[PDB]
């Protein structure tokens, strides 16, 4: 889906306040657990993923592995809470040359390695809640000479509390952001 969508300035793929948050996402958990508890600092329900092996427990965006969703939005935004544990997320994009790239941002690596299919990045997080904005277009331009066209899937791993992961088209500031997308 998302090919016939309107795809306005904002577009959400997972929201922690709803009847079925993980409706399109495919959970695949082993030696881990998934929950929905109320966090003690934002006073709202959040989706909590925790596991021993970060490479086993994850949730992918499209339920069907063969099927892929279509997003033309440049920016991808995550609202995550740092649990001081290993955590990573991976995204697939399509460039003008019609090949599939991968951008994996990891908490437990130091080097920045660039391969034709995988580009692994390090990342550092603050103490509590923080929103991260990916800017897929800039990463596509820097890692490869090509440019961003489409996003094929997003995949987030264990040891993180997720709420309101969404796409965007501009570097929105906190003041101009709508209320429902804010941190407080």
């Amino acid at each position: 889906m998302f090919k016939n969508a309107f795809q306005s300035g904002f577009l959400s793929v997972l929201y922690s306040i709803g009847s079925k948050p993980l409706e399109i996402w495919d959970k695949q958990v082993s030696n881990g657990h998934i929950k929905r508890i109320t966090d003690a600092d934002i006073q709202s329900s959040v989706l909590e993923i925790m596991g021993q092996n970060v490479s086993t427990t994850y949730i992918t965006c499209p339920a069907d592995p063969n099927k892929t969703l279509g997003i033309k939005l440049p920016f991808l935004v995550l609202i995550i809470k740092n649990l001081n544990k290993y955590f990573s997320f991976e995204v697939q994009v399509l460039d003008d040359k019609n090949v599939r790239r991968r951008f994996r941002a990891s908490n437990y690596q130091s080097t920045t390695r660039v391969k034709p299919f995988i580009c692994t990045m390090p990342m550092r997080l603050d103490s509590g809640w923080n929103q991260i904005q990916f800017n897929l277009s800039d990463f596509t331009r820097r890692a490869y000479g090509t440019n961003y066209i489409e996003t094929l899937r997003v995949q987030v791993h264990a040891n993180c509390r997720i709420r309101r992961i969404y796409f965007s088209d501009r570097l929105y500031s906190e003041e101009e952001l709508p209320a429902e997308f804010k941190l407080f």
Partner: peptide, 13 residues
Amino acid sequence: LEKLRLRTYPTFI
């Protein structure tokens, strides 16, 4: 310090 700085932020070519 370099082995930490070039290893904590993402840097491309």
